Amino acid sequence: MLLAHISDTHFRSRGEKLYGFIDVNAANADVVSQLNALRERPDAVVVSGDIVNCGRPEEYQVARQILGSLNYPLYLIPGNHDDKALFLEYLQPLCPQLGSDANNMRCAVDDFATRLLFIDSSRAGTSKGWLTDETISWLEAQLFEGGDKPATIFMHHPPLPLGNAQMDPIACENGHRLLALVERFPSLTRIFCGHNHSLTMTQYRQALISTLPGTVHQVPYCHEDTDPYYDLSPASCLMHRQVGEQWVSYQHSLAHYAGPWLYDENISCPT
Amino acid sequence: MLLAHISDTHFRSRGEKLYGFIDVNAANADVVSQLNALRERPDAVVVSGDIVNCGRPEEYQVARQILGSLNYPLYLIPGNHDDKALFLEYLQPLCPQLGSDANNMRCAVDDFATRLLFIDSSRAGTSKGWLTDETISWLEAQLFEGGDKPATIFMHHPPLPLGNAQMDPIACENGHRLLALVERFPSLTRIFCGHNHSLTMTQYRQALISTLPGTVHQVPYCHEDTDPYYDLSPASCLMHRQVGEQWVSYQHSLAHYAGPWLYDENISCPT
Amino acid sequence: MLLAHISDTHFRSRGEKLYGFIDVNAANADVVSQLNALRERPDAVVVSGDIVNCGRPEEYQVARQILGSLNYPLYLIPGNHDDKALFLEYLQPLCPQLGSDANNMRCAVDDFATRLLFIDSSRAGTSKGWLTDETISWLEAQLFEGGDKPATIFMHHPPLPLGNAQMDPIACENGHRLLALVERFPSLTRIFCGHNHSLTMTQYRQALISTLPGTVHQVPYCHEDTDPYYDLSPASCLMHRQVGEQWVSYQHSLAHYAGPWLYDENISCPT
Amino acid sequence: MLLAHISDTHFRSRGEKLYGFIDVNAANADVVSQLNALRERPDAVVVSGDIVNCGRPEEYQVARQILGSLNYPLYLIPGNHDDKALFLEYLQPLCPQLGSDANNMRCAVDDFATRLLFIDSSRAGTSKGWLTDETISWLEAQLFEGGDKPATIFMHHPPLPLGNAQMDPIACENGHRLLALVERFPSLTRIFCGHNHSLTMTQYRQALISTLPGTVHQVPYCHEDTDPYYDLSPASCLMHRQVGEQWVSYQHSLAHYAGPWLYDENISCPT
Amino acid sequence: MLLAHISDTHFRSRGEKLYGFIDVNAANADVVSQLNALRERPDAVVVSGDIVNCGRPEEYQVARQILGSLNYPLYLIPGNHDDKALFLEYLQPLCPQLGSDANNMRCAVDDFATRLLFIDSSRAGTSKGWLTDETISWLEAQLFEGGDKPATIFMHHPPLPLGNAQMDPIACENGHRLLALVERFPSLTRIFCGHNHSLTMTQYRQALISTLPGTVHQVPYCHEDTDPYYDLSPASCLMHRQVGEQWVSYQHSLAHYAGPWLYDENISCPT
Amino acid sequence: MLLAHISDTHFRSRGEKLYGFIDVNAANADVVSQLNALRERPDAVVVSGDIVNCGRPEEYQVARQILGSLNYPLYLIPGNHDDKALFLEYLQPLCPQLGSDANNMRCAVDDFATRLLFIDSSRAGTSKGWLTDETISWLEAQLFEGGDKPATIFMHHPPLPLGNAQMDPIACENGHRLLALVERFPSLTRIFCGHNHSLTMTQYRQALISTLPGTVHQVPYCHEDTDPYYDLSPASCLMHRQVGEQWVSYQHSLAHYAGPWLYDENISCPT
Numbered sequence A, B, C, D, E, F: 001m002l003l004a005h006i007s008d009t010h011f012r013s014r015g016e017k018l019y020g021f022i023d024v025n026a027a028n029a030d031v032v033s034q035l036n037a038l039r040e041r042p043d044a045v046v047v048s049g050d051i052v053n054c055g056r057p058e059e060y061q062v063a064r065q066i067l068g069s070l071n072y073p074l075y076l077i078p079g080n081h082d083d084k085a086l087f088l089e090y091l092q093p094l095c096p097q098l099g100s101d102a103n104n105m106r107c108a109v110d111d112f113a114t115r116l117l118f119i120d121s122s123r124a125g126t127s128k129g130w131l132t133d134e135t136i137s138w139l140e141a142q143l144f145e146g147g148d149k150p151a152t153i154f155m156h157h158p159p160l161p162l163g164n165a166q167m168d169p170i171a172c173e174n175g176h177r178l179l180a181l182v183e184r185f186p187s188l189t190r191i192f193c194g195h196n197h198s199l200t201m202t203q204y205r206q207a208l209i210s211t212l213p214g215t216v217h218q219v220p221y222c223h224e225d226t227d228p229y230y231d232l233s234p235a236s237c238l239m240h241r242q243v244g245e246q247w248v249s250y251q252h253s254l255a256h257y258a259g260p261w262l263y264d265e266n267i268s269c270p271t
């Protein structure tokens, strides 16, 4: 199992830029060609994202074309910026197991040593996340049926406060419902998130919980400054590899940079 | 508790540059001025690193001066690139609780809600890590006599293989012995490491285990390829903050980049 | 009184670039988000500009949207590149006190310790500036009624030659009419200009007279080379602050750059 | 008359960099080669600066060599970062008319249509400026015996507050005494300064008063914030040219940037 | 004779990017303004190119406008990416001597000391090059009639293998037909090519044969790696100057970079 | 046969930078690490260069160490910036077949399908090139006794004028004498040179003659302008590979740039 995990693509419509000056569409097209030029090739690509920026259909058209051009099976989930209905219209083809129900988009993946769980934390008419009761009971079912086999969950919104002045108020509002599931299920050991446009990470019992940086713009973590900052600091994604018994995640820079070179002992410490 | 956690500074002598072209001294001096210019100021700075590149005195001269210019208490642990005796001679004044025995440099910090444990995984004449008989014993003494207060460990070498072709054969060789301590002490919930020049993370039981990017040059994760790569992809560090019952770590970019701007809803989705 | 003063935005139509390769539309959208993310927030924004590049209506649509997104009262004046009629159609809403008369767009602002005067120096069918007699007599009236209270004037074209081989021939052709006004009125003490895409400054009696750099591309000052150069050297704007009895103007970089850091005496001169 | 006016070079010793990471020596060497490569060559170069950073001899060694490599007559005045005695020892050979008394370094230049006045506002053991009893007297002697010929003054410290939180308390403390000279001598029409690492400008009576950006690092203008910031926003200098009766100053970027291209009307507005 | 020789522009349609992220349209518009801002001005511009990327008419519209804006006579030839019919519809006006026959686009230029020969090596429905028999016999005629006067040939595809794993298989498939012409004709002494997006060069008897880098993206030369790489390494073009008896070609960078400065003996080796 | 051919490294002393600001040492160290990190590894490295800038010993110290760190056999020839005696003292151990007579440093290489000829065109006390009486004789001996085996020559100075205003008067003064050898020996088919810091190429009979860009700074070709320019446009080198009967040379960029990605036909032309 190798997984290329990106999120918060925030696609704009054909020939528009985020905020009028950040070319999210080019940036993402780059990321895609970047991803499908990887040497060690992932088994699938996950997008935990606010996939489009406004939830407009013209935006889904761009996303569909660009994400369509990835040479991998995709797993796609909605975000606060998404529109559940249109997400399903345009993207469901690229991720058939979302279903036909816009209001209950979710699915299990039982291909790898760790089962993957994809859920929709986004709630209509708000930035805040919400886990609905049918999401939770589906999740319980999945975890019970799964038994000892480890599980990881992908969701847009972080299930708990991370101390982020800007991002916490719009975290998953009823994230306790998931935290209680992790208490209930020892097999549940990863939860990965978007929304925060940052690599911020934590542990709750057996569960490693982390947000991902965005593919384009990022938002800094401030603790007592509520100013809605964003910046163009370096974008990356997470690769997830099953390593014997270990789920390991590593950051893979999406920035263009110098190198690599080879380490040489003689060059390292001359005499 | 706010910790600025950097690693693998790899200082060189006054004249010199890493491999002849990477100006690690300048880059770290920048990182330093960067840190002590932060608006939300950390309580202390952790350097889990190969503080110097060759284990040379004039490298420690440079390190002492630059790290000395930080306006924070420091916690310094050595790496395989360090010289135990010289590390103590030059850096112990900047971190008195290392002791005055170069072979058992290690210490506990009890000021915060989570206990901090600093140890020396480096071993003379090999890049491999090793936990000395009584490092292990000292570790177990801290956890045994520590009760409920959660614990986090800083060591240079990662205590288990991560699937990194380059970095795994030079991980902490007897790391399974620390893993035995996490199996036995539910109290031990973070292990943070240098060595890998990368953010890669995994969990083992309650323990979040993660390596850090370097302050200057980075090394990419390859699973199949053993070629000793390094590159100049973006440097960052980890900020560790206590948020109620949670230890959260978030990546703080040390690159220079455009921004920040403020998010404006009308700019975000124009009509 | 804090004033953010930009000019020569040179907007192109939706999805066009200046000269086919300079993205003035993105650059300006950046400037706008930059401006309305300032910490010390200006009381209003002035644009002395060639606001659009060709005077086409599609161009005014872009300008209207982008300038519209600023979170400040605007003061807007035409330039040689502008079309008086369309300027008034699209932008007058964003600057109501221009009037209903396209041919006599001007206004006084008596909010601050210094009165602000906004005038149209642009003349149809030419690059050269022209101050019409009704502009001058309005200006005399304003200056008389104003008495001792200091005045500053904003106009697209510089009222005198600045020794610029390219820019002088297309300076304000009858700028003497204004120079004579400054001789007449001691209270008239600033005149600020666009057109030159440069910070070039001078003094005539009591009057500080300066052109501003553009928000995107710039044009160098050559003394005996008439070649119509332009470049992408760094863009900035002028901030104007009333400082007790002094009108002070300072350059505020619109470029993205490293820093800031804090000055530390110890880091400055080590021992 | 064409003057290349740079300021605040802040040289360091041969090995060293400003604050450990800003390579001021390289940057100035570049600025130098830049200047003596100009197509329209200035008649002289003014450095109003803190020529060196620490007042150290080996800094003056570096400065002497780099400034010595300019292919122009020089006018050098000290700043608060300079050492009066050492400034004279190392730099007086590159600017003989400073005299040979380190405490009254000052001189008039009578070659051009405007008289040039160079003075030393620096004062031992404070960052504050100060005009010595007989600097003031010498100033007034030049203006009194000078008749109609216009005068411009170069001094390191700005002679009045500019509203800069950082820079104002360290302006020229008795600067009002020079202001008294401008009230009394209509002949004195430019005052140009270093210190602020910024282009900020104001007028007092006939006098245009402006500070300059530094050749390397800059300091931003804050009104409310006293935090001692510096940053690496674009460096530039001022070119001063005599154009008939006018002294004009225009900003010459010292950054490296794309361009120039030629303006083509058909490329500008395609059909 | 001065010739500015560019190729493989790969224009996309209005408001599209190559692969979704490389702005070939802006890049080329830059190149054009760059070219027609040259100080030593070429006599004509040659484009050996894959002029558009997909051979769509909307793409030819962009190419026609941008290439149209060059201030030089053009010589234009098709490539594998081109569509012969549409090439002739849109571009023939900018290069009248292509003819009216889309299937036999070629021409001689007898203005300079060296005769220039322009031919179409592109073949419908393939990437491979093909020299048709009527191309060859026209070429023989031209070479015979030409006598002793030297000749150079411009064609999209390289007439022989260059050892390039990616590019060789799609080289000119029957390039032997041209190689045999060079054996036959001593006056034929240059052959210049596109396709390879690289400066790779060789000699066959009297003939210097070289491919050109592209104006935007480039493709590296690999010898036994067939992976279809491309990169954004620096773009350049070739200038061709008749220098007495010598045809000389030099690379002219199309990248934006620092300088130039002037070499100074004293600055070069200080004492 | 694969050759990595670089030129004009222009090393400086340990502390120093070229002209005070170009860090040639770092740049070359980078170029070095770059080269010995190549995936398709050359058989040897050619440096046709002005190996050092001033002909100083401490420059040769630096060069010896950096060039010494290459993991390839080297072929080193001097340029006008070199000192014959010191070049031999420091570099002959890295290239034994130069001999031990500093005035006739030269050698043949017979390992590959094409014979390699290395000579010293430099002449004490002038920038001009010169082929010593018996360099010429030795050259003719190699070609005479060499039969059919093709020959290529590496010399610092170009053997004929190239129309370069700056570089021509300092070409190889008696270069016509080598040209006489190509007229007489059809066997001699490549001449490769340094000196010009540029890729300029021409053919004379069977001989492809080309100069190389420098590893660091470049000099532009001007025909009319004699101003001694240099700039920092992109550095590259030449790779020489034997491909059947062909010697092919291709430019290998040494800049750091975005890419590579893989060409995907569907991404290239979307529907």
Ligand SMILES: [Co+2]
Pocket: A050, A079, A080, A081, A156, A194, A195, A196
């Ligand atoms: Co979100």
Ligand SMILES: [Co+2]
Pocket: A008, A010, A050, A079, A081, A195, A196, A197
């Ligand atoms: Co988002």
Ligand SMILES: [Co+2]
Pocket: B050, B079, B080, B081, B156, B194, B195, B196
């Ligand atoms: Co290590």
Ligand SMILES: [Co+2]
Pocket: B008, B010, B050, B079, B081, B195, B196, B197
């Ligand atoms: Co390390």
Ligand SMILES: [Co+2]
Pocket: C050, C079, C080, C081, C156, C194, C195, C196
């Ligand atoms: Co204008």
Ligand SMILES: [Co+2]
Pocket: C008, C010, C050, C079, C081, C195, C196, C197
């Ligand atoms: Co304008």
Ligand SMILES: [Co+2]
Pocket: D050, D079, D080, D081, D156, D194, D195, D196
């Ligand atoms: Co100062």
Ligand SMILES: [Co+2]
Pocket: D008, D010, D050, D079, D081, D195, D196, D197
């Ligand atoms: Co200063």
Ligand SMILES: [Co+2]
Pocket: E050, E079, E080, E081, E156, E194, E195, E196
């Ligand atoms: Co092609």
Ligand SMILES: [Co+2]
Pocket: E008, E010, E050, E079, E081, E195, E196, E197
């Ligand atoms: Co092509």
Ligand SMILES: [Co+2]
Pocket: F050, F079, F080, F081, F156, F194, F195, F196
């Ligand atoms: Co040379």
Ligand SMILES: [Co+2]
Pocket: F008, F010, F050, F079, F081, F195, F196, F197
């Ligand atoms: Co050279």
